[PDB]
Amino acid sequence: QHILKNPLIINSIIDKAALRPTDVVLEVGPGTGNMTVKLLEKAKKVVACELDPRLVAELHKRVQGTPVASKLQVLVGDVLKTDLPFFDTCVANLPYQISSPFVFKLLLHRPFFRCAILMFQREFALRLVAKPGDKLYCRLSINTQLLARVDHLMKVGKNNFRPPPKVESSVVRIEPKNPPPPINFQEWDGLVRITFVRKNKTLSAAFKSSAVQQLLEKNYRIHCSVHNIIIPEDFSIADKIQQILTSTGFSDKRARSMDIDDFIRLLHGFNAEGIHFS
């Protein structure tokens, strides 16, 4: 993995974290411990989710003998699947291969944390903080922004890692929304996936897909059985989708232009007819 060598950058990440001396700090990807040792000087506890098991020997040996050692818990495993402890802030250097999943593991995690300071690849951070109509606005943008406040903090040159990556990196602060909106994020994501398949084409187009009609026909069958509704022998899911789309004015819009409130109105207009994306 790409270890962060630059003390200049590490020191800058740690102030952006703004550690209070009463905080549990989750560190994902402590590597050789370069940021771990500095975090331990300033935190009440440091929970380190090791990504490479081989590094764990020397990491514990590095802190061994200092008066901070009794604060370093180290969790060897698969961070995506492990249950996470209560932490107050999180700093983390993440590979792209787990970058999208980990962001939502953070945002769905309870109790809420205060903020996370995450190192990502360049383009990935720009998709997070991408506003509607931007070239890079995508499902990640609108999903992350529904649940969090995300801020692009600093660029980080690939010359600072050992061994260097091929792309520049960025540092990003993510503060969860607490309380989070009353949006059933399972359904929310289902709807947003369908409309971002082809984000420069219309929502009407987005629902003529067959995967879609299979998905919604399934869910609509459940609705009608739960509520003793009778599917008329001439019923068509596709026309129902198309009324809802027309009757909410969304039929000719494109997800590239759509902001969060727009999707809430879209979703409310589907759920109100018995259509769920589960």
* Binding-site annotation: residue ranges for S-adenosyl-L-methionine: 2, 4, 29, 50, 78, 93
**Both tokens of residue 94?**
């993440």
Cβ atoms within 10 Å, residue 75:
17
Residue positions counted in the chain? 278
Instruction: Give which of 278, 207, 259, 264 is closest to 236, Cα–Cα.
Output: 207
Name the β-bridge partners of 151: 173
Binding residues: 2, 4, 29, 50, 78, 93
Helices 139-147 and 99-107: angle between axes, nearest 10 degrees: 20
The separation between the first and the last C-alpha atoms of the chain, rounded to the nearest angstrom, is: 37
